[PDB]
């Protein structure tokens, strides 16, 4: 029954083709509500959920100004980390940043987080105490020394357990009808012969919110985790999510396998067994 607010940033350099591409997205739980794309027409932070639209012009001015400032630092950091890693000015590189906070069902602060990546690998991350950093390599330790000297953690922590928590509380209230819902998974099982002696059993989970879910296959009660195909959780487009897990079974032994489903909205964990004549 916990909630979260998270902001995702991506900066991709475009050598010889102008300024980097900057895309920022804000999410409350698994619901996106804000967006900034440097290639979009408006060049403002834009609403992406109905309950945030009620915010006033000054809110969008402040969000536009602050998210642009993130872009400027990411643009600088791309050049700086190019030096740290001794790389050419011809190649395109990527910086990704995620930060946010978690609150419990009563609104109390639970955890803050900030994580940075360079070219798809870990660069630097804030620790759970929000007082210290963990660099991923010796290049990132140069950044760690800079942020430790400027005391970036203390300033960031005030946002992560203060501003972030209070505005997460406000968003949850302004959009309670949509954000405080838990859609349990609609589950079913499909069967697909691949021959006259083998068949694919597929376990489905559709229309659930939030996105966290677990699908597990068991043969005779024992797990089959290394013979299981499990695709990424995917959005349906209406605010819900889908996932499936598959196992190849010998024909006539389908009743030996069971799919187990775990989700926030389920009273008890569901157990699905294929049915035969």
């Amino acid at each position: 029954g916990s909630h979260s607010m998270r902001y995702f940033f991506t900066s991709v350099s475009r050598p010889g083709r102008g300024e980097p591409r900057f895309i920022a997205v804000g999410y409350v739980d698994d619901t996106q509500f804000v967006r900034f794309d440097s290639d979009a027409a408006s060049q403002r932070m834009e609403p992406r959920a109905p309950w945030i639209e009620q915010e006033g012009p000054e809110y969008w001015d402040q969000e536009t100004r602050n998210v642009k400032a993130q872009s400027q630092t990411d643009r600088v950091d791309l050049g700086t980390l190019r030096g740290y890693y001794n790389q050419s000015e011809a190649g395109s590189h990527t910086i990704q940043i995620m930060y946010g906070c978690d609150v419990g069902s009563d609104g109390r602060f639970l955890r803050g987080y900030r994580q940075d990546a360079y070219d798809g690998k870990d660069y630097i991350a804030l620790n759970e105490d929000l007082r210290s950093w963990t660099a991923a390599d010796m290049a990132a330790q140069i950044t760690k020394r800079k942020w430790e000297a400027a005391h970036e953690a203390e300033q960031l922590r005030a946002y992560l357990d203060g501003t972030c928590v209070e505005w997460l509380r406000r968003y949850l209230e302004n959009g309670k009808e949509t954000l405080q819902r838990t859609d349990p998974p609609k589950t079913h099982m499909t069967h697909h012969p691949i021959s006259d002696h083998e068949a694919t059993l597929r376990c489905w989970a559709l229309g659930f919110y939030p996105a966290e879910i677990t699908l597990t296959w068991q043969r005779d009660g024992e797990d089959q985790t290394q013979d299981t195909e499990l695709v990424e959780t995917r959005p349906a487009g209406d605010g819900t999510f889908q996932k499936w897990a598959a196992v190849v079974v010998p024909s006539g032994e389908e009743q030996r396998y069971t799919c187990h489903v775990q989700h926030e909205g389920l009273p008890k964990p569901l157990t699905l067994r294929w049915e035969l004549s």
Binding site: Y59, N66, Y123, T143, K146, A150, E152
Partner: peptide
């Protein structure tokens, strides 16, 4: 809301 401007570079 996003964090306020003023973070130092990497």
């Amino acid at each position: 809301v996003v964090v306020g401007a003023g973070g130092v570079g990497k």
